[PDB]
Coordinates of C-alpha atoms in Angstrom, one line a residue:
Chain E
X1 CA -42.2 25.6 29.8
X2 CA -42.2 29.4 30.7
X3 CA -45.9 29.6 31.5
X4 CA -46.5 29.7 35.1
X5 CA -50.1 29.3 36.5
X6 CA -49.0 30.1 40.2
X7 CA -50.2 33.7 39.9
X8 CA -53.6 32.7 38.7
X9 CA -54.1 29.6 41.1
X10 CA -52.7 31.7 44.1
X11 CA -54.4 35.0 43.3
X12 CA -51.0 36.7 43.2
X13 CA -51.3 40.6 43.2
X14 CA -48.4 43.0 43.2
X15 CA -49.4 46.6 44.1
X16 CA -47.5 49.6 45.3
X17 CA -44.2 50.9 44.1
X18 CA -40.8 51.4 45.7
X19 CA -37.3 50.0 46.1
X20 CA -38.1 47.3 48.7
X21 CA -40.9 44.6 48.4
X22 CA -43.1 43.5 51.2
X23 CA -44.8 40.1 50.9
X24 CA -48.0 39.3 53.0
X25 CA -48.9 35.7 53.9
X26 CA -52.3 34.7 55.2
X27 CA -53.3 32.6 58.2
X28 CA -55.5 29.6 58.2
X29 CA -58.8 30.0 56.3
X30 CA -58.2 33.6 55.4
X31 CA -57.6 35.4 52.0
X32 CA -55.6 38.5 51.1
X33 CA -58.5 40.9 51.9
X34 CA -57.4 40.4 55.6
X35 CA -54.5 42.9 54.8
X36 CA -56.7 45.5 53.4
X37 CA -56.2 48.0 56.3
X38 CA -52.4 47.6 56.1
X39 CA -51.8 47.9 52.2
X40 CA -53.0 51.5 52.0
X41 CA -50.1 52.6 54.3
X42 CA -47.4 50.5 52.3
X43 CA -48.2 51.4 48.7
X44 CA -46.6 54.9 48.8
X45 CA -43.1 53.6 49.7
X46 CA -43.1 49.8 49.0
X47 CA -44.0 47.2 46.3
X48 CA -46.4 44.9 48.0
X49 CA -47.1 41.2 46.9
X50 CA -50.3 39.6 48.1
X51 CA -51.4 36.1 47.6
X52 CA -53.8 33.2 48.9
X53 CA -52.5 30.0 50.4
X54 CA -53.7 27.0 48.6
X55 CA -57.1 25.8 49.9
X56 CA -58.6 29.2 50.8
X57 CA -62.1 29.8 49.8
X58 CA -60.8 32.2 47.1
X59 CA -58.9 29.5 45.5
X60 CA -60.0 26.6 43.4
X61 CA -60.3 23.4 45.5
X62 CA -59.5 21.2 42.5
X63 CA -55.9 22.4 42.8
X64 CA -55.4 21.5 46.6
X65 CA -52.8 18.7 46.4
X66 CA -53.4 16.8 49.6
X67 CA -50.0 15.0 49.6
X68 CA -48.2 18.4 48.8
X69 CA -49.8 20.1 51.8
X70 CA -50.0 17.2 54.4
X71 CA -47.2 18.9 56.1
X72 CA -46.5 22.6 56.3
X73 CA -43.4 22.8 54.0
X74 CA -45.6 22.3 51.0
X75 CA -46.9 25.9 51.6
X76 CA -43.3 27.0 52.1
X77 CA -42.5 25.5 48.6
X78 CA -45.4 27.5 47.1
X79 CA -44.1 30.6 48.7
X80 CA -40.7 30.2 47.3
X81 CA -42.2 29.4 43.7
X82 CA -44.2 32.7 43.9
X83 CA -41.1 34.7 44.8
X84 CA -39.1 33.0 41.9
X85 CA -42.0 33.7 39.5
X86 CA -42.4 37.3 40.4
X87 CA -38.7 38.0 40.6
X88 CA -38.7 39.0 44.3
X89 CA -34.9 39.0 45.0
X90 CA -35.4 40.0 48.7
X91 CA -38.4 40.8 50.7
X92 CA -39.8 41.9 54.1
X93 CA -42.2 38.9 54.9
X94 CA -45.2 39.6 57.1
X95 CA -47.0 36.4 58.0
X96 CA -50.1 35.7 60.2
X97 CA -50.1 32.7 62.3
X98 CA -49.7 29.6 59.8
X99 CA -48.0 31.8 57.3
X100 CA -45.5 33.1 59.9
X101 CA -44.3 29.4 60.3
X102 CA -44.3 29.0 56.5
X103 CA -42.1 32.1 56.0
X104 CA -39.8 30.8 58.8
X105 CA -39.5 27.5 56.9
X106 CA -38.9 29.2 53.6
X107 CA -36.4 31.5 55.1
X108 CA -34.4 28.4 56.2
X109 CA -34.5 26.9 52.7
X110 CA -33.6 30.4 51.1
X111 CA -32.4 33.0 53.6
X112 CA -31.0 35.3 50.8
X113 CA -34.6 36.0 49.9
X114 CA -35.7 37.4 53.2
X115 CA -34.5 40.7 54.7
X116 CA -36.6 39.9 57.8
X117 CA -39.8 38.2 59.0
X118 CA -42.7 39.7 60.9
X119 CA -45.0 37.4 62.7
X120 CA -48.5 37.8 64.0
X121 CA -50.0 35.2 66.4
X122 CA -47.2 32.7 65.5
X123 CA -46.9 29.5 67.4
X124 CA -44.2 26.7 66.7
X125 CA -46.5 24.1 68.4
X126 CA -50.2 24.0 69.6
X127 CA -50.1 21.0 72.1
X128 CA -48.4 20.9 75.4
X129 CA -45.5 18.4 76.2
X130 CA -43.9 17.6 79.4
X131 CA -41.6 20.6 78.8
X132 CA -43.3 22.9 76.6
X133 CA -46.5 25.1 77.0
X134 CA -48.3 25.6 73.7
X135 CA -51.7 26.4 75.3
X136 CA -53.6 23.2 74.4
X137 CA -53.6 19.6 75.7
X138 CA -53.9 17.1 73.0
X139 CA -57.3 16.0 74.2
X140 CA -58.5 19.5 73.6
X141 CA -57.2 19.4 70.0
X142 CA -58.9 16.0 69.5
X143 CA -62.2 17.4 70.8
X144 CA -61.9 20.5 68.6
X145 CA -61.3 18.2 65.6
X146 CA -64.3 16.0 66.6
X147 CA -66.6 19.1 66.7
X148 CA -65.3 20.3 63.3
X149 CA -65.9 16.9 61.6
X150 CA -69.3 16.1 63.3
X151 CA -70.8 19.6 62.3
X152 CA -68.6 21.7 60.3
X153 CA -70.7 24.8 59.8
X154 CA -71.8 24.9 63.3
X155 CA -68.3 24.5 64.6
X156 CA -67.1 27.4 62.3
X157 CA -70.0 29.8 63.0
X158 CA -69.2 29.3 66.8
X159 CA -65.4 29.3 66.9
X160 CA -65.0 32.4 64.6
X161 CA -66.3 34.9 67.1
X162 CA -64.2 33.3 69.9
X163 CA -61.0 33.3 67.8
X164 CA -61.4 36.9 66.7
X165 CA -62.4 37.9 70.2
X166 CA -63.8 41.1 71.4
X167 CA -67.4 41.3 70.3
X168 CA -69.4 39.1 67.9
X169 CA -71.3 41.1 65.3
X170 CA -68.2 43.0 64.7
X171 CA -67.6 43.4 61.0
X172 CA -64.2 41.3 61.4
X173 CA -66.1 38.4 63.0
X174 CA -68.5 38.4 60.1
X175 CA -65.6 38.5 57.3
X176 CA -63.6 35.7 59.3
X177 CA -66.7 33.6 59.5
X178 CA -67.4 34.0 55.8
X179 CA -63.9 33.2 54.8
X180 CA -63.8 30.0 57.0
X181 CA -67.2 28.8 55.6
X182 CA -66.1 29.3 52.1
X183 CA -63.4 26.7 52.4
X184 CA -64.2 23.2 51.2
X185 CA -64.9 21.3 54.4
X186 CA -62.6 18.5 53.5
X187 CA -59.7 20.9 52.9
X188 CA -60.6 22.9 56.2
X189 CA -60.4 19.6 58.1
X190 CA -57.2 18.4 56.4
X191 CA -55.4 21.7 57.0
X192 CA -56.7 21.9 60.6
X193 CA -55.3 18.4 61.3
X194 CA -51.9 19.6 59.7
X195 CA -51.7 22.6 62.0
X196 CA -52.7 20.4 65.1
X197 CA -49.7 18.1 64.4
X198 CA -47.2 20.8 63.3
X199 CA -43.9 21.1 65.3
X200 CA -41.5 23.9 64.4
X201 CA -39.6 23.7 67.8
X202 CA -36.7 21.4 66.5
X203 CA -36.3 23.7 63.5
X204 CA -36.3 27.1 65.2
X205 CA -32.6 27.2 65.6
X206 CA -32.2 26.9 61.9
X207 CA -33.8 30.2 61.4
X208 CA -31.1 32.9 60.8
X209 CA -32.9 36.0 59.4
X210 CA -34.2 38.6 61.9
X211 CA -37.7 37.9 63.4
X212 CA -40.2 40.6 64.6
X213 CA -42.5 38.6 66.9
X214 CA -45.8 40.5 67.4
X215 CA -48.7 39.2 69.3
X216 CA -52.0 40.2 70.9
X217 CA -52.4 40.6 74.7
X218 CA -55.0 37.9 74.5
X219 CA -55.0 35.2 71.8
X220 CA -57.0 32.1 72.2
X221 CA -54.7 30.1 69.9
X222 CA -51.4 31.5 71.3
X223 CA -50.5 32.2 74.9
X224 CA -48.2 35.1 75.2
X225 CA -45.6 33.0 76.8
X226 CA -45.2 31.3 73.2
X227 CA -44.0 34.6 71.8
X228 CA -41.2 34.6 74.4
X229 CA -40.5 31.0 73.8
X230 CA -39.9 31.9 70.0
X231 CA -37.6 34.8 71.1
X232 CA -35.4 32.3 73.1
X233 CA -35.3 29.7 70.4
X234 CA -34.7 31.5 67.1
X235 CA -31.3 31.1 65.7
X236 CA -30.9 34.7 64.6
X237 CA -31.8 38.0 65.9
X238 CA -35.4 38.7 67.2
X239 CA -37.7 41.0 69.2
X240 CA -41.0 40.6 70.8
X241 CA -43.8 43.1 71.0
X242 CA -47.1 42.3 72.9
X243 CA -49.7 44.6 71.5
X244 CA -52.4 46.1 73.5
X245 CA -55.0 44.7 71.0
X246 CA -56.7 41.4 71.6
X247 CA -57.6 38.7 69.3
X248 CA -56.1 36.0 67.0
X249 CA -56.4 38.2 63.9
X250 CA -55.5 41.7 65.1
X251 CA -54.6 43.0 61.7
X252 CA -58.1 42.3 60.8
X253 CA -60.1 43.1 64.0
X254 CA -57.9 45.8 65.6
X255 CA -56.3 47.6 62.7
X256 CA -56.2 51.0 64.5
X257 CA -53.7 49.5 67.0
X258 CA -52.0 46.8 64.9
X259 CA -51.3 48.6 61.6
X260 CA -49.2 51.2 63.6
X261 CA -47.2 48.5 65.2
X262 CA -46.7 46.7 62.0
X263 CA -45.4 49.7 60.2
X264 CA -42.9 50.4 63.0
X265 CA -41.5 47.0 62.7
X266 CA -41.4 47.3 58.9
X267 CA -39.3 50.4 59.0
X268 CA -36.9 49.7 61.8
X269 CA -34.3 46.9 62.0
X270 CA -33.4 45.1 65.1
Chain O
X1 CA -68.7 35.3 40.7
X2 CA -67.8 37.6 37.8
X3 CA -66.0 39.6 40.5
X4 CA -63.8 36.5 41.4
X5 CA -63.3 35.5 37.8
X6 CA -62.0 38.8 36.7
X7 CA -60.1 39.5 39.9
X8 CA -62.1 42.7 40.6
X9 CA -60.6 44.8 43.4
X10 CA -62.1 48.0 44.7
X11 CA -60.0 50.6 46.7
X12 CA -60.1 54.2 47.6
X13 CA -63.1 56.6 48.3
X14 CA -64.9 59.6 46.8
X15 CA -67.7 60.7 44.6
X16 CA -66.0 59.8 41.4
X17 CA -65.1 56.2 40.7
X18 CA -62.2 55.5 38.3
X19 CA -62.2 52.2 36.4
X20 CA -58.9 51.0 34.9
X21 CA -59.0 48.6 31.9
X22 CA -55.8 46.7 31.0
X23 CA -54.4 46.1 27.5
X24 CA -53.7 42.8 25.7
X25 CA -52.1 40.1 27.7
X26 CA -51.7 42.4 30.8
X27 CA -53.1 42.2 34.3
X28 CA -54.0 45.0 36.8
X29 CA -50.6 45.4 38.3
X30 CA -49.7 47.4 35.2
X31 CA -51.6 50.1 37.0
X32 CA -49.5 49.8 40.3
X33 CA -47.7 53.2 40.0
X34 CA -51.0 55.1 39.3
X35 CA -53.4 53.7 42.0
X36 CA -51.6 55.1 45.1
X37 CA -52.1 58.6 43.6
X38 CA -55.8 58.0 43.2
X39 CA -57.0 56.4 46.3
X40 CA -57.0 59.5 48.6
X41 CA -59.4 61.2 46.2
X42 CA -61.3 58.6 44.4
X43 CA -62.8 55.0 44.5
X44 CA -60.7 52.9 42.1
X45 CA -61.9 49.6 40.5
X46 CA -59.2 47.3 39.0
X47 CA -60.0 44.1 37.0
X48 CA -58.4 41.6 34.6
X49 CA -59.9 40.7 31.3
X50 CA -60.4 37.1 30.6
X51 CA -57.4 35.6 29.0
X52 CA -54.9 37.2 31.1
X53 CA -52.3 34.9 32.8
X54 CA -54.0 35.9 36.2
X55 CA -57.2 34.3 35.2
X56 CA -58.3 30.6 34.7
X57 CA -58.0 29.7 31.0
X58 CA -60.9 27.3 31.5
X59 CA -63.2 30.2 31.7
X60 CA -62.0 31.7 28.3
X61 CA -65.1 31.4 26.2
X62 CA -63.8 31.5 22.6
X63 CA -67.2 32.2 21.1
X64 CA -67.8 35.0 23.7
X65 CA -64.5 36.6 23.1
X66 CA -64.4 36.1 19.3
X67 CA -65.1 39.8 18.8
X68 CA -64.1 42.7 21.0
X69 CA -67.9 43.1 21.6
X70 CA -67.5 40.3 24.3
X71 CA -65.2 42.2 26.6
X72 CA -67.7 45.2 26.9
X73 CA -70.2 42.8 28.3
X74 CA -67.8 41.8 30.9
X75 CA -67.1 45.5 31.7
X76 CA -70.8 46.5 31.9
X77 CA -71.6 43.3 33.9
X78 CA -68.6 44.2 36.2
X79 CA -69.8 47.8 36.4
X80 CA -73.3 46.6 37.4
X81 CA -72.2 43.9 39.9
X82 CA -70.1 46.5 41.8
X83 CA -72.7 49.1 41.7
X84 CA -70.8 51.8 39.7
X85 CA -73.0 54.5 38.3
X86 CA -70.8 56.8 36.3
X87 CA -67.0 56.2 36.0
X88 CA -63.9 57.7 34.8
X89 CA -62.6 55.0 32.5
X90 CA -58.9 54.6 31.8
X91 CA -58.2 52.0 29.1
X92 CA -54.9 51.0 27.6
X93 CA -54.9 49.9 24.0
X94 CA -57.6 47.2 23.5
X95 CA -59.3 48.3 26.7
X96 CA -59.6 51.8 25.2
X97 CA -61.4 50.2 22.4
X98 CA -63.6 48.3 24.8
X99 CA -64.6 51.2 27.0
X100 CA -65.4 53.0 23.8
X101 CA -67.6 50.2 22.5
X102 CA -69.0 50.0 25.9
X103 CA -69.8 53.8 26.0
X104 CA -71.8 53.6 22.9
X105 CA -74.4 51.3 24.6
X106 CA -74.1 53.1 27.9
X107 CA -73.1 56.8 27.8
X108 CA -74.8 57.3 31.3
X109 CA -72.0 55.1 32.9
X110 CA -68.9 57.2 31.7
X111 CA -68.2 60.6 32.9
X112 CA -65.3 60.5 30.3
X113 CA -62.8 58.1 28.7
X114 CA -59.1 58.3 28.9
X115 CA -57.3 56.2 26.4
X116 CA -53.6 55.1 26.2
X117 CA -52.2 53.8 23.1
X118 CA -55.7 53.6 21.7
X119 CA -56.1 52.6 17.9
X120 CA -59.4 51.9 16.0
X121 CA -57.6 49.8 13.2
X122 CA -54.3 48.4 13.0
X123 CA -54.1 47.7 9.2
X124 CA -53.6 50.3 6.6
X125 CA -56.3 50.9 3.8
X126 CA -56.0 53.4 0.9
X127 CA -57.2 56.4 2.9
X128 CA -56.0 55.4 6.3
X129 CA -52.7 54.9 8.1
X130 CA -52.7 52.4 10.9
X131 CA -49.0 51.5 11.1
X132 CA -49.2 48.0 9.7
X133 CA -49.7 46.5 6.3
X134 CA -51.8 43.4 6.2
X135 CA -48.8 41.3 5.5
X136 CA -47.2 42.6 8.6
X137 CA -50.0 41.5 10.8
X138 CA -50.0 38.3 8.8
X139 CA -46.3 37.6 9.5
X140 CA -46.9 38.4 13.3
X141 CA -49.8 36.0 13.5
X142 CA -47.7 33.2 11.7
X143 CA -44.8 34.0 14.1
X144 CA -47.0 33.6 17.2
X145 CA -48.4 30.3 15.8
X146 CA -45.0 28.9 14.8
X147 CA -43.2 29.5 18.1
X148 CA -45.1 31.3 20.9
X149 CA -42.5 31.7 23.4
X150 CA -39.8 32.9 20.9
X151 CA -42.2 35.4 19.3
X152 CA -43.0 36.9 22.8
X153 CA -39.4 37.0 24.1
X154 CA -38.5 39.0 21.0
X155 CA -41.6 41.2 20.6
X156 CA -42.1 42.1 24.2
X157 CA -38.9 44.4 24.6
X158 CA -39.7 45.8 21.0
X159 CA -43.3 46.6 22.2
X160 CA -42.3 48.1 25.5
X161 CA -39.5 50.1 23.8
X162 CA -38.0 53.1 25.7
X163 CA -35.2 51.9 28.0
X164 CA -33.6 48.5 27.3
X165 CA -33.6 45.5 29.7
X166 CA -36.0 47.2 32.1
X167 CA -38.1 45.9 35.0
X168 CA -41.1 46.8 32.7
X169 CA -39.8 44.5 29.9
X170 CA -39.4 41.5 32.4
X171 CA -43.0 42.0 33.7
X172 CA -44.5 42.3 30.1
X173 CA -42.6 39.3 29.1
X174 CA -43.7 37.4 32.1
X175 CA -47.5 38.2 31.7
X176 CA -47.4 37.4 28.0
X177 CA -45.8 34.1 28.5
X178 CA -48.4 33.2 31.1
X179 CA -51.2 33.4 28.6
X180 CA -52.2 30.0 27.2
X181 CA -51.0 29.9 23.7
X182 CA -54.4 29.2 22.0
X183 CA -56.0 32.1 23.8
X184 CA -53.1 34.4 22.9
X185 CA -53.5 33.4 19.2
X186 CA -57.3 33.8 19.4
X187 CA -57.2 37.3 21.0
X188 CA -54.3 38.7 18.8
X189 CA -56.2 37.7 15.6
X190 CA -59.2 39.6 16.8
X191 CA -57.2 42.6 17.6
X192 CA -55.4 42.3 14.2
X193 CA -58.7 42.6 12.2
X194 CA -60.7 44.7 14.5
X195 CA -62.1 48.0 13.1
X196 CA -63.8 50.5 15.4
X197 CA -64.1 53.4 12.8
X198 CA -67.8 53.1 11.9
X199 CA -68.7 53.4 15.6
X200 CA -66.4 56.3 16.6
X201 CA -69.2 58.8 15.7
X202 CA -71.5 57.3 18.2
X203 CA -68.8 57.8 20.9
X204 CA -70.3 60.8 22.3
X205 CA -68.7 60.7 25.8
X206 CA -65.7 63.0 26.0
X207 CA -62.5 61.3 25.4
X208 CA -58.9 62.1 26.5
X209 CA -56.5 60.6 24.0
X210 CA -53.1 60.2 25.5
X211 CA -50.4 58.8 23.1
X212 CA -46.8 58.0 23.6
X213 CA -44.1 58.9 21.1
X214 CA -42.6 55.9 19.4
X215 CA -45.4 53.6 20.1
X216 CA -44.7 50.5 17.6
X217 CA -48.3 49.8 17.6
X218 CA -49.9 53.2 17.2
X219 CA -48.5 55.9 15.1
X220 CA -49.1 59.5 16.4
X221 CA -51.5 60.2 13.4
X222 CA -53.9 57.7 14.8
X223 CA -54.4 59.9 17.9
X224 CA -55.4 62.6 15.6
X225 CA -57.8 60.5 13.7
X226 CA -59.5 59.4 16.8
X227 CA -59.7 63.2 17.8
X228 CA -61.3 63.9 14.3
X229 CA -63.7 60.9 14.4
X230 CA -65.3 60.8 17.9
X231 CA -68.8 62.1 18.1
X232 CA -68.3 64.1 21.3
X233 CA -65.6 66.2 22.8
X234 CA -62.0 65.1 22.6
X235 CA -58.5 66.2 23.1
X236 CA -55.1 64.7 22.3
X237 CA -52.0 64.8 24.3
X238 CA -48.8 63.4 22.9
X239 CA -46.6 62.4 25.8
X240 CA -42.8 62.4 26.0
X241 CA -42.8 58.9 27.3
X242 CA -41.9 56.3 24.7
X243 CA -43.3 52.9 24.0
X244 CA -46.6 50.9 24.0
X245 CA -47.1 50.6 27.8
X246 CA -46.0 54.1 29.2
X247 CA -48.1 53.6 32.4
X248 CA -45.9 50.6 33.1
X249 CA -42.5 51.6 31.6
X250 CA -42.5 55.4 32.2
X251 CA -44.8 56.1 35.1
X252 CA -42.8 59.0 36.3
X253 CA -44.1 60.9 33.0
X254 CA -47.3 59.0 32.4
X255 CA -48.8 59.3 35.9
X256 CA -48.8 63.1 36.2
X257 CA -50.4 63.3 32.6
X258 CA -53.1 60.9 33.8
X259 CA -53.8 62.7 36.9
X260 CA -54.1 66.0 35.0
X261 CA -56.6 64.4 32.5
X262 CA -58.6 62.7 35.3
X263 CA -59.2 66.0 37.1
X264 CA -59.4 68.4 34.2
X265 CA -62.4 68.0 31.8
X266 CA -62.7 69.6 28.4

C-alpha cells in the first residue's frame, strides 16, 4: 500500500535546502548527471529534486513498460507520481528537450504543482508540415530511424558529436555518447520513434503556467524559429532567450554560459 | 556496479574527503542540509546502504547482511572503487557502528570517525545500560512483524522526536515505509541483537561522539561509555538538538556542530 518504488526505479534524489523546490527533468538518453554543473549553484537556496526518466541507461530496463511510454504522457504520469510521492506541493520545473514537453503536459494536468516551467532545446514537433517548420522533413526522420536500427552503436557514436556540437573529444561529447550507448537498443529505438511522432502543437494553448523558453543559437534538433513558435502558441505567459552557446545540450556542454542564464530565469518571474 | 547499486554520488573538491553513512532505513537525502556547507572545502561521497527504499530489494542479500559485518564490506568496497584513501567518516546510528567495524580492519582509511546517535548495544545487561530491556526489543520486533505500516506510522514520529508533525517526520516515515517489510524485519533484528563492545578497544582511530539529548534509541550515558571504551582518542559532545535524527530534524543546530568536529581534531 504505502510502499512506493518510484524513488528507487527513477533514481530520485532530493538535495539542497530552502523554501522553494526546483525539479530537473532530463532529455532523451541522458541521466541526472547532466545537471551536475547547475546543482552546485542551486543547493544553497533551493531544494532540488533530480530523477531519471524511465529507459535511461541508469535505470533498470525490465521496468520500461512499452505501452505506458508509447506516447509521451506516460512520462508525464511518472513526473506527477514523483511529485506526489516526494510531497512536492509546488516547484520550478527545468526540463531539457523531451522533459520540457513532459513538464508542459504535466503542468496541464496539474497546474497547481508548477510555479513555472523553464525549457531548454524544446520542440513541440520535429517534422515539417505544410504550415509548420520543425526543422526536419519526414523522410529525414525515416532515414535517421533507418540508420539507428541498422547499426545502433555506429549511429550513436556518429550522432552524439553532431548533436552536442562544437568539438568532438570534448568531455561533454564523451559523456553524452556514453549515456546514449548505455540505453538498451530496443528502448532507445522505441523512444526515438515516440519523439519522431510527438506533436504538442494542438495542446500548447492548454499550457497556462509561465514558460521560460531558452535555447542555443545553433541546435541541430531545434531551429531557433521553433522557440518563437512556442512563445506565440503557449496559453499563458512566456519569454524567449536565445543564448550565445551552441549545441543541443548546452547545460552539459556550455555550462559557463548556460548555468548563468538558467539561474537568471529561476530567480526572476515574467 | 557497486556505485550504481548503492547510489554513490561524489561532489566537492579538496584534500580531505568526507564520507557520509546513513542510519537504518534512511537514504542519503538525510544529509541534504550538511552537504552544501562541505563542498566548497571538501570532496563528499554519499551512498545508500542496501535495504534502503532507494535501492533495489532484489539485491538485498540476506546472508550477506545477516550481521553488521556485511555493511562494512560494502563501505570498503565503495571506498576502494571510488579511490578514496583516507576519509573523514560521518555515520548516523548503525552507520556509526559500521564505520567503526570498518576502521578496525582499515585504520589507514579513516582520518577520524564522527558518530551521531551511535550505540554499541541496545539491550541492557547487568553492568550496562543501553536504554532497552530485552522484552522491549522483543515487543518492537513483534510489532513490526504483526503490522509493518502501523508500527512505522507510530514509531517514526516517536523516533524523530523534537518538534511534532514536522517535515522531518514525514520524510522519515516515507523512507521507512518504502523498505520491503522482510528486509526491514531482517535488518531490525540484527540491530536489536548487535554488540560492538568487544571490538571498541580495537577502534584506535579518533572518534567524535555527537549525541542528541532525548534520543529514544541512545541514552546520554551511552556516549560516555563509548568515550571510555574506544582504543584511541575520543571526545563527546552532547547537543541541544533533540531526537534520533538531528541531522535531519534539527540541522540548524546539528550542522554547525558537525562542521566544528570535521575541522577541529583532538
